[PDB]
């Protein structure tokens, strides 16, 4: 993929006590056109891992197809071994570096969340193979708009609850719908705990437009 | 009689005799023993020297920080398969940054050795392996066969005169689980001693030990690092 | 002679290598499979040669997909290989067409891979027969068996191995088209206990697997509480 | 079962690989001895005519400034494996900028015997050199089997020479004494008058490189016999 | 960068700067630009340091194998044509190398200039780098095949000094070698700030 | 180009214009951009004619072989997936926008759009081409779930008429097609049959 | 259009002594004018005697270290010993020239112990030209750190001075003083300072905070 055609904007991520949460809008934009408005960009990887992606949706479908068969083939052996989230993270970093090195990249930037053996995982991988780990992520214009809100809370309270993390996520999406132009007020949230991967349906933020009456004000 | 000179030929009774003959090459190597507790997995071998004034042949090999093998059969097949294992483990650490499970390595070994059994112009691998490792499912002991078959085991001995060690292990299986490391190594050494004549006994020169566990990478103890494990053996009469 | 290659005919149009490869299946332990009204059930007579082998070694029931199971009898390395081929067939099918492979189609694709080994001088035929079994809401329950020659037929009940005759003579008694899976489990265990001979070979393990409504098109090993409840019925029905 | 290297005997044997071993006894005998002062190598040349220049009979060769080889068996196999060892010792220098050990040279040269080329190599080699671990002597066999040895004899009269080394060897020797012992053993397995053209001799000490002896240095040890 | 080499009665002299540079920044001032290929051959570095080092180490790897196979030390012309034919297979791909091969063989003192473009020239005077033009003058007015050894040392030292004085990408120390029939020998490593004092007053 | 597809309970409806341009010259004014892949699976074709025609022929080959060797009628998802693999594996070499509409016993009437990059997504109504930009609002303000065959034909004709009236690279004839278990009906609207809308005079 | 490189900040430093060796780095990772994370150290332990620093494009930093870790195990398998600092350096010199026409945009510094216990520092280019040194800086602030090291370690442009050898306690204070100043003028030098000391007894680590601006 040398140029993207149908794209997805920011994905968010933040840890909490006993899990991770990811959020992403349900839009695929064709340039400046909102063309597909009920696509899911969050993926149901095995019960310890989930995935969300920004960028070219076709490449995200390709990865959705490959990882699915990987996980299936892992399940078919039946021997008590499963791919941790860190393994999926490393495999994606390799898969994108190898495509970068052939100049046929995968035009994606994604957020991996997981929970295994009591510790949480949140990971990043770019088109080029740049990967890292943080308690808070945001791709695209999220990195300018939302991540300042996540970090400011995680320096005054490094350990969060599921409820506070959900509130913070919804606040960040409220800001992204305001100041990003390729956004949409219908999004999904996915969460990992010991219970596993639980995706929520189309969610909307309530928006305030009181500043519109300040012409003379 | 005359369905024997090729591996792609069945007999009227439904057998391939070249594979059965390759299995007889494991009986030509020195004896090895493998056993496991719930925390550790042990391999003890008995090394053999060609000339008296030379060094003893090395029987145990390092494959990764959590897997190791002891070999009985042809040396060349062992040296090829060990180099296969090592690269298959490096390939797993490179991609996933995790250690490769042992079941998924022995499955690959079987898939590899199955080809010479079916296509002509290649020889069956005349080497048997006992594979000791430790992963997220505990300790493991695996036997691998020239027939491209493999078994998961509580304990096993292979090589010349290994039925004695097998008979020993078969009546002490009920103890190995809650045994500590010293007792487990001693059971292995006694099963190995049961393969010798009454003339000979175990010695620093002709004993190698390989251990892997939760808090222990695969280490090998060869000549003077073995003498802690020998101290404690009852001097058996006959 | 006329019986040393699979590229060779005899004066009466027979290929004896392919028959000698079936002679190897006849000398292996017995597996059966029965197609119920709402699923399929596999049972295997798993022999334990030594007490040093763990409980779970030499598994002869394989998961080839998340809706397909496989039971084998013959050479076991050959069976593991053919399982690996049956897995990449179903993998590439989903990769190219985007849905789960049917079993009539998977059976054909594996049968042809097996038949290709009956034509050449550089290879022998496979030394294993095997059954496949699936369940779907549209396609329903299905059971196919594949032989070394490359033949593939559908079944309501089938057996492979030593006690093939003795096992089908018991399976025809069953009115399998009326019953459910939990009731056919008892029958599967009963047949495996009837045909097993303790004097001809040592103790054995019973190995079972399922696919149907009660697993939601997911091929599963039978739980322990049901396998024991069927092994008990097998013992109590041996009073005959 | 005897012909072909892809065919097992009913007892699990490879008779072609053993017949490759039997091709070593058709070569003249060579001896290698360890010592904490260094290693020695001593061989018979088997000159067939006074017309042939015996310096064109390469039975001891330099692999590097710290490793020397002695061979017995087929000439072609030896040329191949010696070129392999020389190339590997320098690829190692190019990559890591250090000296390969004798164990690793032997390990890398034995890996070609693990390739059925369609025929086993009909040649055995002794590798004598000095490493971080001191002087080391190794022995490679057509099966690709290699092992450290304190003293080893290969070739025609390997049995008697080995049956003498086990008596004259101890792990306290000097190099001048081991050189004397090797030539005394070599004297007894020859129906030709030992002289300074019927033998080669080399040494590899720690503070000195590989050094093949000369006619002068050879005669000055033949005299004390 | 500045290198020079001339062959005279008593062998070949080799001198060089010690500076490396990435644009305007001075990364290193302790660089060994004379490459000890073998105990009987010397090289130089000008252009791609990674190209100079890699391909001359590869040259050493072939020279040693030559000596082992043939039991004779290679010639200087052969050693030069190996390198030339090796770097000619990467012509236009973007290698940058300028290097002199110096040594003594059965023909006498030898000096050969090899470039990645494909030049291969024999001569009695060469200089390579940005400061080559500033060394050529001094080394041309001061040359004589009948020079003495200390005079040759002084000439090379002062030519490198005068080249470092003007050129901006040249400086540091002056590492001087001497090729002979018994191999080569390192002579000096003199900081330019030292020689400034003695050659001023 | 202006292509369009709609699903109702029984099956689907398809629609397309008839213009093929080379710059501003109309090379073919009676083009047939509807294409039978199978008995009950159709393709609405947009983009480069060469690339899309070739992809259609290849997918027809694939699906015929597949359906004969299975001996059951193929799915719409299957053809859509083959289109996806070809349009994604050769996305740097093809300019191909596709809509796949048809009927299948398992899931019934289905609509799958496969834009240039080769992503696939099921839809209730799908519009594609160069004139869809001018009717993205009309089809959103007029679509209603629960429409029958005739109401969907009306909807699809009214939309394409507008897209043809405004788009320069679209015009001529509205080629419709309805697909269901019974069969495949095909209409051709031309002249006064094409819907007319008020053009302001003041 | 697609450019396959990006500069993710980074700064690395190494000093050698007679019985020790330090390799230090910042922990900030950047992307243009933004900050990815403030916990991403550029130092990696290879053996008990050797440490490496890596700065530049982060994908190559991740790939190359894995390649090195996979080559160390192969060396140990074939030669039955762990590698030396010079052998690792000369191997990396070839691993880098393997990509002479598509290089690893990585600035490398190795720091460890010689074979008699002395310190050793090897500095690399992206294409494998290496150089043993006493001290070297690398990364975005390399132009800012090396003058003060030339002064306070090499004793350059300072007359009538005590040419005392650098002890560990002095070197560590010096290492902290240079990052404290590079965090004031360089915008890529960031949040924390990791310092990995190498000695005959093993390898330590120390974290020291810097200003988050």
Swiss-Prot record, chain A:
Protein name: Proteasome subunit beta type-4
Full-sequence range covered: 46 to 262 of 264
Alphabetized UniProt keyword annotations: Acetylation, Cytoplasm, Disease variant, Host-virus interaction, Nucleus, Phosphoprotein, Proteasome
Residues bearing the modification Phosphotyrosine: 57
Function per UniProt: Non-catalytic component of the 20S core proteasome complex involved in the proteolytic degradation of most intracellular proteins. This complex plays numerous essential roles within the cell by associating with different regulatory particles. Associated with two 19S regulatory particles, forms the 26S proteasome and thus participates in the ATP-dependent degradation of ubiquitinated proteins.
Induction profile: Up-regulated in fibrolamellar carcinomas.
Major localization listed first in the record, in broad terms: cytoplasm
Gene Ontology biological process: negative regulation of inflammatory response to antigenic stimulus; proteasome-mediated ubiquitin-dependent protein catabolic process
Intracellular or extracellular location(s): Cytoplasm; Nucleus
Assigned protein family: Belongs to the peptidase T1B family.
Signal peptide feature range: none
From Swiss-Prot, chain C:
Source organism, top-level taxon: Eukaryota
Subcellular localization, as worded in the UniProt entry: Cytoplasm; Nucleus
Gene Ontology, cellular component aspect: cytoplasm; cytosol; extracellular exosome; nucleoplasm; nucleus; proteasome complex; proteasome core complex; proteasome core complex, alpha-subunit complex
Stated induction or repression of this protein's expression: Down-regulated by antioxidants BO-653 and probucol. Up-regulated by bacterial lipopolysaccharides (LPS) and TNF.
UniProt keyword Nucleotide-binding present: no
Matching PROSITE patterns: PROTEASOME_ALPHA_1 (PS00388), PROTEASOME_ALPHA_2 (PS51475)
Residue list for modification N6-acetyllysine: 51, 200, 224
Keywords assigned by UniProt, alphabetized: Acetylation, Cytoplasm, Host-virus interaction, Nucleus, Phosphoprotein, Proteasome
GO terms, molecular function: ubiquitin protein ligase binding
CDD domains in the cross-refs: proteasome_alpha_type_3
Gene Ontology biological process terms in this record: proteasome-mediated ubiquitin-dependent protein catabolic process
Phosphoserine sites (modified residues): 237
Coiled-coil ranges (or none): none
Subunit: The 26S proteasome consists of a 20S proteasome core and two 19S regulatory subunits. The 20S proteasome core is a barrel-shaped complex made of 28 subunits that are arranged in four stacked rings. The two outer rings are each formed by seven alpha subunits, and the two inner rings are formed by seven beta subunits. The proteolytic activity is exerted by three beta-subunits PSMB5, PSMB6 and PSMB7. Interacts with AURKB. Interacts with CDKN1A. Interacts with MDM2 and RB1. Interacts with the C-terminus of TBXA2R isoform 2. Interacts with DNAJB2.
Family from the record: Belongs to the peptidase T1A family.
Name this protein carries in UniProt: Proteasome subunit alpha type-3
Organism the protein comes from: Homo sapiens
Gene label: PSMA3
Curated annotation (Swiss-Prot), chain E:
Effect of residue 50 to V: Displays high resistance to the bortezomib, a proteasome inhibitor of the chymotrypsin-like activity
GO cellular component, one term: cytoplasm
Catalytic center residues: 1 (nucleophile)
Known EC number: 3.4.25.1
Domain of life: Eukaryota
Keyword field contains Nucleotide-binding: no
Induction: Down-regulated by IFNG/IFN-gamma (at protein level). Induced in breast cancer tissue. Up-regulated by sulforaphane in breast cancer cells.
Reported effect, residue 49 to T: Displays resistance to the bortezomib, a proteasome inhibitor of the chymotrypsin-like activity. Displays high resistance to the bortezomib, a proteasome inhibitor of the chymotrypsin-like activity
Cell compartment(s), UniProt: Cytoplasm; Nucleus
An annotated Gene Ontology molecular function: peptidase activity
Binding site for bortezomib: 49
Keyword Nucleus set for record: yes
Reaction catalyzed: Cleavage of peptide bonds with very broad specificity
Biological process (GO), any one: proteolysis
Keywords, ordered alphabetically: Cytoplasm, Host-virus interaction, Hydrolase, Nucleus, Protease, Proteasome, Threonine protease, Zymogen
Family under the similarity heading: Belongs to the peptidase T1B family.
Known role: Component of the 20S core proteasome complex involved in the proteolytic degradation of most intracellular proteins. This complex plays numerous essential roles within the cell by associating with different regulatory particles. Associated with two 19S regulatory particles, forms the 26S proteasome and thus participates in the ATP-dependent degradation of ubiquitinated proteins.
Protein name, per record: Proteasome subunit beta type-5
Species the sequence originates in: Homo sapiens (Human)
Lineage: Eukaryota, Metazoa, Chordata, Craniata, Vertebrata
From Swiss-Prot, chain G:
PANTHER family xrefs: METALLOPROTEASE TLDD, PROTEASOME SUBUNIT BETA TYPE-1
Record's GO cellular component terms: cytoplasm; cytosol; extracellular exosome; extracellular region; ficolin-1-rich granule lumen; nucleoplasm; nucleus; proteasome complex
Glycosylation sites: 30, 181
Residues the record lists as Phosphotyrosine modifications: 122
Pfam families per the UniProt record, alphabetical: Proteasome
Name the UniProt record assigns to this protein: Proteasome subunit beta type-1
Subunit-level organization: The 26S proteasome consists of a 20S proteasome core and two 19S regulatory subunits. The 20S proteasome core is a barrel-shaped complex made of 28 subunits that are arranged in four stacked rings. The two outer rings are each formed by seven alpha subunits, and the two inner rings are formed by seven beta subunits. The proteolytic activity is exerted by three beta-subunits PSMB5, PSMB6 and PSMB7. Interacts with SERPINB2. Interacts with RFPL4A. (Microbial infection) Interacts with HIV-1 protein Tat.
Modified residues (N6-acetyllysine): 176
Family that this chain belongs to: Belongs to the peptidase T1B family.
Species for this entry: Homo sapiens (Human)
Keywords: Acetylation, Cytoplasm, Deafness, Glycoprotein, Host-virus interaction, Intellectual disability, Nucleus, Phosphoprotein, Proteasome
A GO BP entry: proteasome-mediated ubiquitin-dependent protein catabolic process
Subcellular localization, as worded in the UniProt entry: Cytoplasm; Nucleus
Modification Phosphoserine occurs at: 34, 40, 134
Gene3D superfamilies per UniProt: Glutamine Phosphoribosylpyrophosphate, subunit 1, domain 1
């Amino acid at each position: 993929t040398q140029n993207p055609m149908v794209t997805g904007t920011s994905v968010l991520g933040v840890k909490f006590e006993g899990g991770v949460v990811i959020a992403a809008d349900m839009l695929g934009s064709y340039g400046s056109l909102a063309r597909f408005r009920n696509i899911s960009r969050i993926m149901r990887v095995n019960n310890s891992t989930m995935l969300g992606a920004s960028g070219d949706y076709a490449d995200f479908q390709y990865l959705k197809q490959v990882l699915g068969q990987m996980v299936i083939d892992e399940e078919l052996l039946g021997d008590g071994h499963s791919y941790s989230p860190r393994a999926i993270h490393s495999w994606l970093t390799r898969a994108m570096y190898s495509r970068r090195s052939k100049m046929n990249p995968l035009w994606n930037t994604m957020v991996i969340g997981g929970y295994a053996d009591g510790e949480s995982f949140l990971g990043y991988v770019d088109m080029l193979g740049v990967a890292y780990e943080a308690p808070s992520l945001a791709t695209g214009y999220g990195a300018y708009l939302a991540q300042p809100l996540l970090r400011e809370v995680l320096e005054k309270q490094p350990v969060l609850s599921q409820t506070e993390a959900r509130d913070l996520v919804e606040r960040c999406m409220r800001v992204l719908y305001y100041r990003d132009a390729r956004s949409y007020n219908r999004f999904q949230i996915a969460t990992v705990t010991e219970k596993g991967v639980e995706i929520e349906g189309p969610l909307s933020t309530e928006t305030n437009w009181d500043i519109a009456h300040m012409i003379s004000g | 009689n005359q369905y024997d000179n090729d591996v792609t030929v069945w007999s009227p009774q439904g057998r391939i005799h070249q594979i059965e003959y390759a299995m007889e090459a494991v009986k030509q190597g020195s004896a090895t023993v493998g056993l496991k507790s719930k925390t550790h997995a042990v391999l003890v071998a008995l090394k053999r020297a060609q000339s008296e004034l030379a060094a003893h042949q090395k029987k145990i090999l390092h494959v990764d920080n959590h897997i190791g093998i002891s070999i009985a059969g042809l040396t060349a097949d062992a040296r090829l398969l060990c180099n296969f294992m090592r690269q298959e483990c490096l390939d797993s650490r490179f991609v996933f940054d995790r250690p490769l499970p042992v079941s998924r390595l022995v499955s690959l070994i079987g898939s590899k050795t199955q080809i010479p059994t079916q296509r002509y112009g290649r020889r069956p691998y005349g080497v048997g392996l006992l594979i000791a490792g430790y992963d997220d499912m505990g300790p493991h002991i695996f036997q691998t066969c020239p027939s491209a078959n493999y078994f998961d085991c509580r304990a096993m001995s292979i090589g010349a005169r290994s039925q004695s060690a097998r008979t020993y292990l078969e009546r002490h299986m009920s103890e190995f689980m809650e045994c500590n490391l010293n007792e487990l190594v001693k059971h292995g050494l006694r099963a190995l001693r049961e393969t010798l004549p009454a003339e000979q006994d175990l010695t620093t020169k002709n004993v190698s030990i390989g251990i892997v566990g939760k808090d222990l990478e695969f280490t090998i103890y060869d000549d003077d690092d073995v003498s802690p494990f020998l101290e404690g053996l009852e001097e058996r009469p006959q | 002679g006329y019986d040393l290659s699979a590229s060779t005919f005899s004066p009466d149009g027979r290929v004896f290598q392919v028959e000698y490869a079936m002679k190897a299946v006849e000398n292996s332990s017995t597996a059966i499979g029965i197609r119920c009204k709402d699923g399929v059930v596999f049972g295997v007579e798993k022999l334990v040669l030594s007490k040093l082998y763990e409980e779970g070694s030499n598994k002869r029931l394989f998961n080839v997909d998340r809706h397909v199971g496989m039971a084998v009898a013959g050479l076991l390395a050959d069976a593991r290989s053919l399982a690996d081929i049956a897995r990449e067939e179903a993998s590439n099918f989903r990769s190219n067409f985007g849905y789960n492979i049917p079993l009539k189609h998977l059976a054909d694709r594996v049968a042809m891979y097996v038949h290709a080994y009956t034509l050449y001088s550089a290879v022998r035929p496979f030394g294993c027969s095997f059954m496949l079994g699936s369940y779907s809401v549209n396609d329903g329950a299905q059971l196919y068996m594949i032989d070394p020659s490359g033949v593939s037929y559908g079944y309501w009940g089938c057996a492979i191995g030593k006690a093939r005759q003795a096992a089908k003579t018991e399976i025809e008694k069953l009115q399998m088209k009326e019953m459910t899976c939990r009731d056919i489990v008892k029958e599967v265990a009963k047949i495996i206990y009837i045909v097993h001979d303790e004097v001809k070979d040592k103790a054995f393990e019973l190995e079972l697997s399922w696919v149907g409504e009660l697993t939601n098109g997911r091929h599963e090993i039978v739980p322990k509480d049901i396998r024991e409840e069927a092994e008990k019925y097998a013992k109590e029905s041996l009073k005959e | 079962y005897d012909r072909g290297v892809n065919t097992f005997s009913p007892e699990g044997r490879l008779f072609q690989v053993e017949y490759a071993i039997e091709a070593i006894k058709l070569g003249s005998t060579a001896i290698g001895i360890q010592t904490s002062e260094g290693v020695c190598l001593a061989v018979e040349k088997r000159i067939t005519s006074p017309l042939m220049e015996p310096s064109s009979i390469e039975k001891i060769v330099e692999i590097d400034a710290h490793i020397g080889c002695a061979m017995s068996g087929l000439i072609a196999d030896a040329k191949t494996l010696i070129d392999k060892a020389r190339v590997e010792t320098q690829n190692h220098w190019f990559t890591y900028n250090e000296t390969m050990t004798v164990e690793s040279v032997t390990q890398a040269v034995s890996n070609l015997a693990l390739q059925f080329m369609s025929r086993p190599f009909g040649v055995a080699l002794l590798f004598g050199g000095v490493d971080e671990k001191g002087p080391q002597l190794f022995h490679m066999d057509p099966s690709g089997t290699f092992v450290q040895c304190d003293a080893r004899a290969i070739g025609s009269a390997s049995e008697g020479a080995q049956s003498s080394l086990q008596e004259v060897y101890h792990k306290s020797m000097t190099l001048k004494e081991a050189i004397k012992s090797s030539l005394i053993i070599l004297k007894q397995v020859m129906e030709e008058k030992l002289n300074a053209t019927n033998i080669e001799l080399a040494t590899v000490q720690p503070g000195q490189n590989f050094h093949m002896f000369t006619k002068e240095e050879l005669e000055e040890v033949i005299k004390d016999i | 960068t500045t290198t020079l080499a001339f062959k005279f009665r008593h062998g070949v002299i080799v001198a060089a700067d010690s500076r490396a540079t990435a644009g305007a920044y001075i990364a290193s001032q302790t660089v060994k630009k004379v490459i000890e290929i073998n105990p009987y051959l010397l090289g130089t570095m000008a252009g791609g340091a990674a190209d100079c080092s890699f391909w001359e180490r590869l040259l050493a790897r072939q020279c040693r194998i030559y000596e082992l196979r043939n039991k004779e030390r290679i010639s200087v012309a052969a050693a030069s044509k190996l390198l030339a034919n090796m770097v000619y297979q990467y012509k236009g791909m973007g290698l940058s190398m300028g290097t002199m091969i110096c040594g003594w063989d059965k023909r006498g003192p030898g000096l050969y200039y090899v470039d990645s473009e494909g030049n291969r020239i024999s001569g009695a005077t060469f200089s390579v780098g940005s400061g080559s033009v500033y060394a050529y003058g001094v080394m041309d007015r001061g040359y004589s095949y009948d020079l003495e050894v200390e005079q040759a040392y002084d000439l090379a030292r002062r030519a490198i000094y005068q080249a470092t004085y003007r050129d901006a990408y040249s400086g540091g120390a002056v590492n001087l070698y001497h090729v002979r029939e018994d191999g080569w020998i390192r002579v000096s490593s003199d900081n330019v700030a030292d020689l400034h004092e003695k050659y001023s007053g | 180009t202006t292509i369009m597809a709609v699903q109702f309970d029984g099956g689907v409806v398809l629609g397309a214009d008839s213009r093929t341009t080379t710059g501003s010259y109309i090379a073919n004014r009676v083009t047939d951009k509807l294409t039978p892949i199978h008995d009950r699976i159709f393709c609405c074709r947009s983009g480069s004619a060469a690339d899309t025609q070739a992809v259609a022929d290849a997918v027809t080959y694939q699906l015929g072989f597949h359906s004969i060797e299975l001996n059951e009628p193929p799915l719409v998802h299957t053809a859509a997936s083959l289109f996806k693999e070809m349009c994604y594996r050769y996305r740097e070499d093809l300019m191909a926008g596709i809509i796949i509409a048809g009927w299948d016993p398992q899931e019934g009437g289905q609509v799958y759009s496969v834009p240039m990059g080769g992503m696939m997504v099921r839809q209730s109504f799908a519009i594609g081409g160069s004139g869809s930009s001018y009717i993205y609002g009309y089809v959103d303000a007029t679509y209603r779930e629960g429409m029958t065959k005739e109401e969907c034909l009306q909807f699809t004709a009214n939309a394409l008429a507008l897209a043809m009236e405004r788009d320069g690279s679209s015009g001529g004839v509205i080629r419709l097609a309805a697909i269901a278990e019974s069969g495949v009906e095909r209409q051709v609207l031309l002249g006064d049959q094409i819907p007319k809308f008020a053009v302001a005079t003041l | 259009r697609f450019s396959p490189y990006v500069f993710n900040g980074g700064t690395i430093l190494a000093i050698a002594g007679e019985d020790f060796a330090i390799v230090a780095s910042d922990t900030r990772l950047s992307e243009g004018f933004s900050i990815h994370t403030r916990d991403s150290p550029k130092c990696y332990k290879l053996t008990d005697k050797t440490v490496i620093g890596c700065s530049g494009f982060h994908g190559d930093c991740l790939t190359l270290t894995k390649i090195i870790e996979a080559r160390l195990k192969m060396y140990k398998h074939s030669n039955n010993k762990a590698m030396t600092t010079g052998a690792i350096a000369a191997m990396l010199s070839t691993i880098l020239y393997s990509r002479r026409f598509f290089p690893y945009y990585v600035y490398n510094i190795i720091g460890g112990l010689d074979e008699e216990g002395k310190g050793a520092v090897y500095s690399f280019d992206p294409v494998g030209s290496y150089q043993r040194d006493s001290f070297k800086a690398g990364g975005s602030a390399s132009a800012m750190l090396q003058p003060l090291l030339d002064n306070q370690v090499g004793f350059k442009n300072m007359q009538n001075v005590e040419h005392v050898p650098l002890s560990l306690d002095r070197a560590m204070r010096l290492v902290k003083d240079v990052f404290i100043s590079a965090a004031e003028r360089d915008v890529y030098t960031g949040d924390a300072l990791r310092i990995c000391i190498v000695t005959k007894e093993g390898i330590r680590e120390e974290t020291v905070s810097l200003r988050k601006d």
